[PDB]
């Protein structure tokens, strides 16, 4: 039944052993274990998994000539980019387009720009509230 | 190029008395220097007849007496500081007549910087006063820096010291004082000390110690007066107690080994509170670091023990061989050092013979070097003594090789030697050449002598095998064809395509003893004098199977046909009680080794480790973990890593039920130290590996010292694995992380700071990662070692390699050791993706570890290649073996 | 009561430090503290640290300090830190 296969294809990203992790990302990859049409949803799936955050984002950022050829690639990137917060994720955001913008994008020509805005308005916030907010955390936490 | 143009003394002086005064103080000055003064004067002969003086001096501002900085026997002319060759080169006007003897003298003063190089300062906290104490480290190149001197190791004369230091300190130096301390006439202030003349010694082995600490003493039966001296708060818990216990059998165990008794009157020892080093001999005041002299029965595991009395017996054993015959020029400086550090395993032996410690140096010394000499880029032991000149040319000799090979290639040499041979040959040595300095070849004439004396057998002169062994680079596999008893040797090249640079005088050719034995029997002696020999010796039939290099008393690998192989495994399945202890050990590292050479199958290298089940020996349980390593490390991101896990489950799970019934639930150790590491090798391999028994037995401990603040359960030996494991299991992190702030003793702090490593969750460990940047929270020399510990836990690989991604020009630019940082961090790299982002890195951008990176570049290379050559295939083995 | 020697420049064991020791109520201007009542009983009090210890020997007495207090019997004894029989205390 698709729903059952669908919500488990999401719970095992919820795992926290990063070799299962990384071993669901290869069986991702192979098209007869997980099917061409959700690898790139279980990809998301497991970037929503903060453990693999750093996974996906170095496969990404390492291979993505491969996933461009084959997987939706705007989406994806939104996904991997969203929880960065520093100027060195925003660094690694622009490196990346720079390595491999010689290529283009597809449909994620547009998204890429619009993750590199985004992630620099997160900067400036997180400068400015990382203090008050913790500060607001720690008193009513007690 | 003149004679200060040249870094070698002239032979044409020789001196034959000394004398120095030192006033440390060690209050700073008013520009917030700390400074001595100091006065010297030499008696030296004229040996050639000369019209120059020339003597090592470095960073001293000197007095000038007579418009010049010394007083001399004709006119001098001029005197200057030629700062590149350090020489006080002082031209007399008439020329120096030879055959008499001349006072050089001086009064000079100098710097009490920390820099741990001559008469440095050392600063440590006591209760709440930042005490300061005056000590001396002179490894080479700095005896000179304290007072002026012909600096050599050749140039041996006797010394008087005389100290004057603030009236509440006790002064120290290689004799006793003479006379007690007396105040000073100058200022009542001050104490003065004087001590009685030293035997003949060279320069590098003075000390010059000013102090607070406190002492505990032994008279020995040998006479020998023998005292530990520490911080006085330190030494009344008792923990000298442990020093002062063993020192004493120590000593006697020397004095037999080389039929000579201790030739000094006293032998102090004394535990520093900060140390570069862990030990340095210096004659008759051997200093070590708190760490490695003290002990505390309440808290340092056995480790700590089989640590102290190691490196007790090394810088014992130094107090004859080496300062007593001393070495003609630094390079034989592995003719010392390597020695010791074989005779220290003896040593201990002496002082704990219920350890059976002999056996480790094959794990620490042995292999630890085989593994960094099987590369082209290695080099031999007996460099030319042209070749080392500079300072920096001396202070390189001090690596891996020198100590450790050395050891290896000494144990063979007392090993196809009978060892009362070696015995024998050892004592007529420094009986002969006593307080006189030598070349090797001194000691190969002697052992030469004793040899024939005994006329022991040999296929020929033992000068001619151990430079065979000596001045050549890297060591032979021996392969066997028992199908016919056919031998043969090559030389053992790690990676097999590496291009060999630089040449052999033998093309790499050894004469090697082969102990063997044969179903468990013991066969005759047999020497290898060509490439290829064979003998019936090593012939077989049915089921007869033969191993060599029985004990692994000689320095090379072994290699057998497939079918001697599958005979050995027979054997050891049926029982390995009958293969001694050390060569099941032998056994699986030469098969992983092998393998990693592509002269077998890693399948047999992975058949080796079957046995293990059924194991219970420390060696090879370590053995198998040791070389596993690198397949963990390399796939434990991998599927790969899923089989393996349970793999290793089933190979330990009986071990652990053993020592569970063994120490009745864990309330008592092992009373033998070597079932002690079997068993925290159990514990930790089980529990990291995921038996359900240690997540309930461990969590229960921790939560049993959480109930007990103040009470600790946890047996020392066992809390740097349980704490880790039960971290791996927020309020036991935050408990661990008060626990460390208020942590008080530095070696739980460590082992806190480990564990907390341990931890699963992200948020946790990019705190940790936050705090390593707050010099209040980490101690900033510390942080390094907290990067570390969170690299190798999985979850913070990628973590770690962004965050120096962002950070690296700013640490790189302000602080440190960023070359094994480096290395920890890119160890796992192993497809191309991570090479393409580490050339970028260095696109994109080392300090001492730029050459590291290029390291981290080729073996990723080698990784690359070696995964895609071996994953189905080990892969398929562990699947196999996952029932 | 005794001391070990302390404070950086001397021997945690060489030989103890502050030694005091007392026979309570014996007055050497007295002579022997005799035992007239027809009862006594024999109390020791240590007043000293780390390894260091110390202890009574019988000395060349037929019987030990405390142990009399076993209910042995006598016709007179008589105490005293001055020359009888002698049992001395050493410290280890
Ligand atoms: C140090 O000086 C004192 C007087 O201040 C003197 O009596 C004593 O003998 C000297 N030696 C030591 C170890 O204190
Ligand atoms: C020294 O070691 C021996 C071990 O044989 C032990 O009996 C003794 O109690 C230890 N301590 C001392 C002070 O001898
Ligand atoms: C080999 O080593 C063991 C110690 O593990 C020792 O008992 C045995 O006598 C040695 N035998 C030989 C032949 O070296």
């Given at each position: 039944?698709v729903?059952?296969?669908?919500?488990?294809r999401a719970?095992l990203?919820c795992?926290?052993?990063?070799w299962?992790?990384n071993?669901?990302?290869?069986?991702?990859?192979?098209?007869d274990l997980?099917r061409?049409?959700d690898?790139?949803?279980?990809?998301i799936?497991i970037?929503n998994?903060?453990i693999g955050?750093?996974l996906?984002?170095?496969?990404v950022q390492?291979?993505?000539?491969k996933?461009?050829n084959?997987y939706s690639?705007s989406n994806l990137?939104?996904?991997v980019?969203?929880r960065?917060?520093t100027?060195?994720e925003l660094?690694?955001l622009?490196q990346?387009?720079?390595?491999?913008?010689?290529?283009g994008?597809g449909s994620?020509?547009?998204?890429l720009?619009?993750?590199?805005?985004?992630?620099?308005?997160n900067?400036?916030?997180?400068?400015?509230?990382?203090?008050?907010v913790?500060?607001?955390?720690t008193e009513?936490?007690? | 190029?003149?004679?200060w143009?040249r870094?070698?003394?002239?032979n044409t002086?020789?001196?034959?008395?000394?004398?120095?005064?030192?006033?440390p103080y060690?209050?700073?000055?008013?520009?917030?220097?700390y400074?001595?003064?100091?006065?010297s004067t030499?008696?030296?002969?004229?040996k050639?007849?000369?019209?120059?003086?020339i003597?090592?001096?470095?960073?001293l501002?000197?007095?000038?007496?007579?418009?010049?900085?010394?007083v001399?026997?004709?006119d001098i002319?001029?005197?200057?500081?030629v700062?590149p060759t350090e020489?006080?080169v002082?031209?007399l006007k008439?020329?120096?007549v030879?055959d008499?003897?001349?006072?050089?003298?001086?009064?000079?003063?100098?710097?009490?910087a920390?820099?741990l190089?001559g008469?440095?300062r050392?600063?440590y906290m006591?209760?709440n006063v930042?005490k300061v104490?005056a000590?001396?480290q002179?490894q080479?190149?700095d005896?000179?820096?304290?007072?002026?001197?012909?600096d050599?190791?050749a140039?041996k004369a006797?010394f008087?010291?005389?100290?004057?230091?603030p009236?509440?300190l006790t002064?120290?130096?290689?004799?006793?004082?003479?006379?007690?301390?007396?105040?000073?006439?100058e200022?009542p202030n001050?104490?003065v000390t004087?001590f009685?003349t030293?035997?003949?010694?060279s320069?590098?082995?003075?000390?010059?110690?000013?102090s607070?600490?406190?002492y505990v003493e032994?008279?020995?039966?040998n006479?020998?007066?023998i005292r530990?001296?520490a911080?006085?708060?330190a030494?009344?818990?008792?923990?000298?107690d442990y020093?002062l216990?063993?020192?004493g059998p120590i000593?006697?165990?020397?004095?037999?080994?080389?039929?000579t008794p201790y030739?000094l009157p006293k032998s102090?020892?004394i535990?520093?509170?900060?140390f570069?080093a862990?030990?340095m001999?210096?004659w008759?005041?051997?200093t070590?670091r708190?760490?490695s002299?003290?002990?505390?029965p309440?808290?340092?595991?056995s480790?700590?023990?089989?640590?102290?009395?190691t490196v007790?017996?090394?810088?014992?054993?130094?107090?004859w061989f080496?300062?007593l015959?001393?070495?003609?020029?630094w390079?034989?400086?592995?003719?010392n050092?390597?020695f010791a550090?074989?005779?220290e395993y003896?040593?201990?032996?002496?002082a704990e013979?219920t350890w059976?410690?002999k056996?480790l140096?094959?794990l620490?010394?042995?292999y630890?070097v085989?593994?960094?000499?099987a590369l082209?880029?290695s080099?031999?032991?007996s460099t030319?003594?042209?070749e080392?000149?500079?300072?920096?040319q001396?202070?390189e000799?001090?690596?891996?090789?020198?100590?450790?090979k050395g050891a290896?290639?000494?144990?063979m040499?007392?090993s196809?030697?009978?060892?009362?041979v070696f015995k024998?040959?050892?004592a007529s040595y420094?009986?002969?050449?006593?307080?006189?300095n030598?070349?090797?070849?001194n000691?190969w004439?002697?052992?030469?002598?004793?040899?024939?004396?005994?006329?022991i057998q040999l296929?020929?002169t033992?000068?001619?095998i151990?430079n065979r062994?000596?001045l050549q680079?890297?060591?032979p596999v021996i392969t066997?064809?028992?199908?016919?008893?056919?031998?043969?040797?090559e030389?053992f090249?790690?990676?097999?395509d590496?291009?060999?640079?630089?040449p052999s005088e033998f093309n790499?050719?050894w004469?090697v003893?082969?102990?063997?034995?044969r179903?468990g029997?013991?066969?005759?002696?047999?020497?290898?004098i060509?490439?290829?020999?064979?003998?019936?010796?090593f012939?077989?039939?049915?089921?007869?199977?033969?191993?060599?290099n029985?004990?692994?008393?000689?320095?090379?690998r072994?290699?057998?046909?497939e079918?001697?192989?599958?005979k050995i495994?027979?054997?050891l399945?049926?029982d390995?009680?009958?293969?001694?202890?050390?060569?099941?050990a032998?056994?699986i590292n030469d098969?992983?080794n092998?393998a990693?050479?592509?002269?077998?199958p890693?399948?047999?290298?992975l058949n080796?480790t079957?046995?293990?089940i059924?194991?219970?020996?420390y060696?090879?349980?370590?053995?198998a973990?040791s070389?596993?390593?690198?397949?963990?490390?390399?796939?434990?991101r991998?599927?790969?890593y899923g089989p393996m896990?349970?793999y290793?489950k089933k190979?330990?799970t009986?071990?652990?039920?053993?020592?569970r019934?063994?120490?009745?639930?864990?309330?008592?150790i092992?009373?033998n130290?070597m079932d002690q590491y079997?068993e925290?090798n159990?514990i930790?391999?089980?529990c990291s590996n995921?038996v359900?028994?240690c997540?309930?037995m461990v969590?229960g401990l921790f939560?049993?010292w959480?109930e007990?603040?103040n009470?600790?359960p946890?047996?020392?030996?066992?809390?740097?694995?349980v704490?880790?494991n039960?971290?791996?299991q927020?309020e036991?992190?935050?408990?661990?992380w008060?626990?460390?702030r208020?942590?008080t003793?530095?070696?739980?702090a460590?082992?806190?700071r480990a564990?907390?490593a341990?931890?699963?969750?992200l948020?946790?460990?990019?705190?940790?990662?936050?705090?390593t940047?707050?010099?209040?929270?980490i101690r900033?020399?510390?942080?390094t070692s907290?990067?570390i510990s969170?690299?190798?836990?999985?979850?913070?690989?990628g973590?770690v390699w962004?965050?120096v991604?962002?950070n690296?020009?700013?640490?790189?630019?302000?602080?440190?050791?960023f070359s094994?940082?480096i290395?920890?961090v890119?160890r796992?790299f192993?497809?191309?993706?991570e090479?393409?982002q580490?050339?970028?890195?260095?696109?994109?951008?080392?300090?001492s570890?730029?050459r590291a990176l290029?390291?981290?570049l080729e073996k990723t290379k080698?990784n690359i290649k070696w995964?895609?050559?071996?994953?189905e295939?080990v892969?398929?083995?562990?699947?196999?073996?996952?029932k | 009561?005794?001391k070990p020697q302390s404070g950086g420049?001397?021997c945690?064991n060489?030989?103890?430090?502050g030694?005091?020791?007392?026979?309570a109520?014996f007055?050497?201007?007295?002579?022997?503290?005799?035992?007239?009542?027809s009862?006594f009983?024999?109390?020791?009090?240590?007043?000293y640290?780390?390894?260091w210890?110390?202890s009574?020997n019988t000395?060349?007495?037929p019987f030990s300090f405390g142990?009399?207090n076993?209910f042995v019997?006598?016709?007179?004894?008589?105490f005293?830190?001055?020359?009888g029989?002698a049992?001395p205390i050493?410290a280890?």
């Amino acid at each position: 039944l698709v729903n059952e296969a669908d919500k488990l294809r999401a719970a095992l990203a919820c795992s926290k052993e990063l070799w299962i992790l990384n071993r669901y990302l290869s069986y991702t990859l192979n098209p007869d274990l997980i099917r061409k049409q959700d690898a790139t949803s279980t990809i998301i799936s497991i970037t929503n998994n903060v453990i693999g955050q750093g996974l996906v984002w170095d496969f990404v950022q390492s291979n993505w000539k491969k996933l461009f050829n084959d997987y939706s690639f705007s989406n994806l990137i939104q996904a991997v980019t969203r929880r960065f917060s520093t100027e060195y994720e925003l660094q690694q955001l622009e490196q990346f387009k720079k390595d491999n913008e010689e290529t283009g994008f597809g449909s994620g020509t547009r998204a890429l720009e619009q993750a590199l805005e985004k992630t620099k308005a997160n900067i400036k916030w997180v400068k400015e509230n990382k203090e008050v907010v913790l500060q607001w955390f720690t008193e009513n936490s007690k | 190029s003149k004679a200060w143009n040249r870094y070698r003394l002239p032979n044409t002086l020789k001196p034959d008395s000394y004398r120095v005064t030192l006033r440390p103080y060690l209050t700073p000055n008013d520009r917030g220097l700390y400074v001595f003064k100091g006065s010297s004067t030499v008696r030296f002969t004229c040996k050639e007849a000369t019209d120059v003086i020339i003597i090592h001096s470095k960073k001293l501002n000197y007095t000038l007496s007579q418009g010049h900085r010394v007083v001399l026997p004709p006119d001098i002319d001029k005197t200057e500081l030629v700062e590149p060759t350090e020489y006080l080169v002082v031209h007399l006007k008439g020329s120096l007549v030879k055959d008499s003897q001349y006072e050089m003298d001086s009064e000079f003063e100098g710097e009490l910087a920390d820099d741990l190089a001559g008469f440095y300062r050392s600063e440590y906290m006591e209760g709440n006063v930042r005490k300061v104490v005056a000590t001396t480290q002179m490894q080479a190149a700095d005896a000179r820096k304290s007072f002026p001197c012909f600096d050599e190791p050749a140039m041996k004369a006797e010394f008087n010291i005389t100290l004057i230091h603030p009236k509440d300190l006790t002064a120290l130096s290689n004799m006793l004082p003479k006379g007690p301390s007396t105040p000073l006439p100058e200022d009542p202030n001050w104490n003065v000390t004087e001590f009685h003349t030293t035997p003949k010694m060279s320069t590098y082995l003075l000390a010059f110690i000013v102090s607070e600490f406190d002492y505990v003493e032994k008279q020995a039966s040998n006479g020998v007066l023998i005292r530990i001296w520490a911080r006085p708060s330190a030494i009344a818990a008792g923990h000298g107690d442990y020093a002062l216990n063993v020192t004493g059998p120590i000593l006697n165990f020397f004095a037999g080994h080389y039929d000579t008794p201790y030739p000094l009157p006293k032998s102090d020892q004394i535990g520093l509170p900060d140390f570069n080093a862990g030990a340095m001999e210096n004659w008759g005041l051997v200093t070590y670091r708190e760490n490695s002299l003290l002990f505390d029965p309440l808290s340092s595991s056995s480790s700590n023990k089989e640590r102290v009395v190691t490196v007790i017996a090394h810088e014992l054993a130094h107090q004859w061989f080496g300062n007593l015959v001393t070495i003609e020029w630094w390079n034989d400086l592995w003719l010392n050092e390597g020695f010791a550090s074989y005779v220290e395993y003896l040593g201990a032996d002496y002082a704990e013979p219920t350890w059976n410690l002999k056996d480790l140096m094959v794990l620490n010394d042995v292999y630890r070097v085989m593994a960094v000499d099987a590369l082209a880029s290695s080099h031999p032991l007996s460099t030319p003594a042209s070749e080392i000149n500079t300072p920096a040319q001396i202070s390189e000799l001090f690596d891996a090789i020198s100590y450790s090979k050395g050891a290896s290639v000494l144990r063979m040499l007392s090993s196809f030697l009978s060892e009362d041979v070696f015995k024998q040959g050892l004592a007529s040595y420094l009986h002969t050449f006593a307080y006189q300095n030598t070349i090797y070849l001194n000691l190969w004439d002697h052992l030469q002598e004793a040899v024939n004396n005994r006329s022991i057998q040999l296929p020929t002169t033992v000068r001619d095998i151990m430079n065979r062994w000596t001045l050549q680079m890297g060591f032979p596999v021996i392969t066997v064809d028992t199908s016919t008893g056919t031998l043969s040797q090559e030389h053992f090249l790690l990676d097999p395509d590496s291009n060999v640079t630089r040449p052999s005088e033998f093309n790499y050719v050894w004469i090697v003893p082969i102990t063997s034995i044969r179903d468990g029997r013991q066969q005759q002696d047999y020497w290898l004098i060509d490439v290829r020999a064979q003998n019936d010796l090593f012939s077989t039939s049915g089921n007869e199977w033969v191993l060599l290099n029985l004990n692994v008393t000689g320095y090379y690998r072994v290699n057998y046909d497939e079918e001697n192989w599958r005979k050995i495994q027979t054997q050891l399945q049926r029982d390995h009680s009958a293969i001694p202890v050390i060569n099941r050990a032998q056994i699986i590292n030469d098969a992983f080794n092998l393998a990693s050479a592509h002269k077998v199958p890693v399948t047999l290298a992975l058949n080796n480790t079957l046995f293990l089940i059924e194991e219970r020996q420390y060696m090879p349980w370590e053995a198998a973990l040791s070389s596993l390593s690198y397949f963990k490390l390399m796939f434990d991101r991998s599927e790969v890593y899923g089989p393996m896990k349970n793999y290793l489950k089933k190979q330990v799970t009986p071990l652990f039920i053993h020592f569970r019934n063994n120490t009745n639930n864990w309330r008592e150790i092992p009373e033998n130290l070597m079932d002690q590491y079997s068993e925290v090798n159990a514990i930790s391999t089980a529990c990291s590996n995921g038996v359900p028994e240690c997540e309930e037995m461990v969590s229960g401990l921790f939560k049993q010292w959480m109930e007990n603040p103040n009470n600790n359960p946890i047996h020392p030996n066992l809390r740097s694995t349980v704490y880790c494991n039960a971290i791996a299991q927020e309020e036991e992190w935050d408990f661990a992380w008060e626990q460390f702030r208020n942590a008080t003793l530095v070696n739980e702090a460590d082992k806190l700071r480990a564990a907390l490593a341990c931890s699963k969750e992200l948020w946790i460990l990019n705190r940790y990662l936050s705090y390593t940047l707050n010099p209040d929270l980490i101690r900033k020399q510390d942080a390094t070692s907290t990067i570390i510990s969170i690299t190798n836990n999985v979850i913070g690989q990628g973590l770690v390699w962004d965050f120096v991604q962002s950070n690296w020009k700013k640490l790189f630019n302000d602080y440190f050791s960023f070359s094994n940082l480096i290395q920890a961090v890119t160890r796992r790299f192993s497809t191309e993706y991570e090479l393409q982002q580490l050339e970028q890195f260095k696109k994109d951008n080392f300090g001492s570890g730029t050459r590291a990176l290029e390291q981290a570049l080729e073996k990723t290379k080698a990784n690359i290649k070696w995964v895609k050559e071996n994953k189905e295939v080990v892969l398929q083995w562990f699947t196999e073996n996952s029932k | 009561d005794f001391k070990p020697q302390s404070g950086g420049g001397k021997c945690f064991n060489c030989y103890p430090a502050g030694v005091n020791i007392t026979l309570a109520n014996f007055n050497e201007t007295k002579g022997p503290l005799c035992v007239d009542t027809s009862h006594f009983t024999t109390k020791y009090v240590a007043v000293y640290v780390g390894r260091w210890s110390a202890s009574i020997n019988t000395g060349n007495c037929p019987f030990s300090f405390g142990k009399v207090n076993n209910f042995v019997k006598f016709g007179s004894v008589c105490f005293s830190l001055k020359d009888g029989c002698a049992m001395p205390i050493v410290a280890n």
